[PDB]
Nucleic acid binder design. Structure first.
Length: 95
DNA sequence: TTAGTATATGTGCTGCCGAAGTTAGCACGCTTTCCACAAGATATATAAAGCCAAGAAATCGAAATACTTTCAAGTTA
């Protein structure tokens, strides 16, 4: 179980299944998507997840003890949104 | 035969609670059977329309996609 014996290189020249979908997506990207952008919500999620990576408290007494319950709670307050798009109305919190 | 005793003799006492009767003057005001006589419940046109419930077709309601708009960030300049 090492990395020196593990496959950067173009993922091709092997009998695969998902690689066909991957190449189709690459072609669809080269068609209209330009460089690496238009991923607004994607970068939002990325940064909002990185904001909580390895941040230490200002005081030593504010260290979260091991095993503390973290609960994810979505909230739907507003009516002003897409009732059509599967429903994505409002923010989600952690407590 | 006569004095002592038990009884009933009607009598006379006590309470016994109740009995009739009282309280003043106007103006307002259901069951068994048994029973018998006649009335369900019966075919049958019959024209007529209104009603009350299975089916068949129709269209309304709206849900999952297809167009256009719209930004917003990024391109040739």
């Amino acid at each position: 179980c090492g990395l020196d014996k593990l496959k950067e290189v173009i993922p091709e020249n092997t009998d695969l299944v998902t690689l066909g979908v991957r190449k189709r997506f690459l072609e669809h990207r080269e068609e209209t998507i330009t460089i690496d952008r238009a991923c607004r919500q994607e970068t939002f999620v990325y940064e909002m997840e990185s904001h909580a990576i390895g941040k230490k408290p200002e005081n030593s007494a504010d260290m979260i003890e091991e095993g503390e319950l973290i609960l994810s709670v979505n909230i739907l307050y507003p009516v002003i949104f897409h009732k059509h798009k599967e429903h994505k109305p409002y923010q989600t919190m952690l407590v």
